[PDB]
């Protein structure tokens, strides 16, 4: 509300989780030089730090039969 | 405080979708004379409207070898 | 004269495979109908939003 998300103005370090339970996909973003992580809308994270999202998914590859 | 769910207290018509993306399985429940459908925990719908759940499953069943 | 080199704008990725030893995307390009493969690392840099779109749909949560 007061101080949430990307507005805190820190540079994003890594995505530590993701959830769609609201109705839109969100990442749990851990930021550099902070240790409280918060949620961001995936649409924003996709445009603002595209390599962090690509890096997040790349670790999580699975192969189906 | 707005807590729409199974608690909305309207009578169920049919189950119109299902998802288990969160660790728990949930039905997208359609209610009578409303056009706002919401999610309910499956374990509740199993206990509260068992024939509505069974009706959802019977349509949609397929056979593998 | 193949691959990303053709200079077409990428439209969508339809599958991916690492069996060559590197991660590869099947890229469908805008305004052409011969689709070929691209290196994943290259696609990340050149069309990150296409890659995101491809990965995004395939997301699931396992036990």
């Amino acid at each position: 509300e007061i101080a949430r998300g990307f507005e805190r103005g820190l540079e994003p370090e890594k995505i530590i989780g993701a959830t769609d339970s609201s109705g839109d996909l969100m990442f749990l973003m851990k930021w550099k030089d902070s240790d409280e992580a918060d949620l961001v809308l995936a649409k924003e994270a996709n445009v603002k730090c595209p390599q962090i999202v690509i890096a997040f998914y790349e670790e999580r590859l699975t192969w189906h039969a | 405080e707005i807590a729409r769910g199974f608690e909305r207290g309207l009578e169920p018509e049919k189950i119109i979708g299902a998802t288990d993306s969160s660790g728990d399985l949930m039905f997208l429940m359609k209610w009578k004379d409303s056009d706002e459908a919401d999610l309910v925990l499956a374990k509740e719908a199993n206990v509260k409207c068992p024939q509505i759940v069974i009706a959802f499953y019977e349509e949609r069943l397929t056979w593998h070898a | 004269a193949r691959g990303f080199e053709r200079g077409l704008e990428p439209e969508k990725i339809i599958g991916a495979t690492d069996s060559s030893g590197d991660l590869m995307f099947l890229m469908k390009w805008k305004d052409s109908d011969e689709a070929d493969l691209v290196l994943a690392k290259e696609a990340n840099v050149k069309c990150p939003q296409i890659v995101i779109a491809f990965y995004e749909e395939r997301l699931t949560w396992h036990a």
Partner: peptide, 16 residues
């Protein structure tokens, strides 16, 4: 909080 689970991207080679 419960959606903090595995988080896999499902990818298949069934094409080609």
């Amino acid at each position: 909080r419960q959606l903090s689970r595995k988080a896999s991207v499902k990818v298949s080679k069934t094409w080609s």
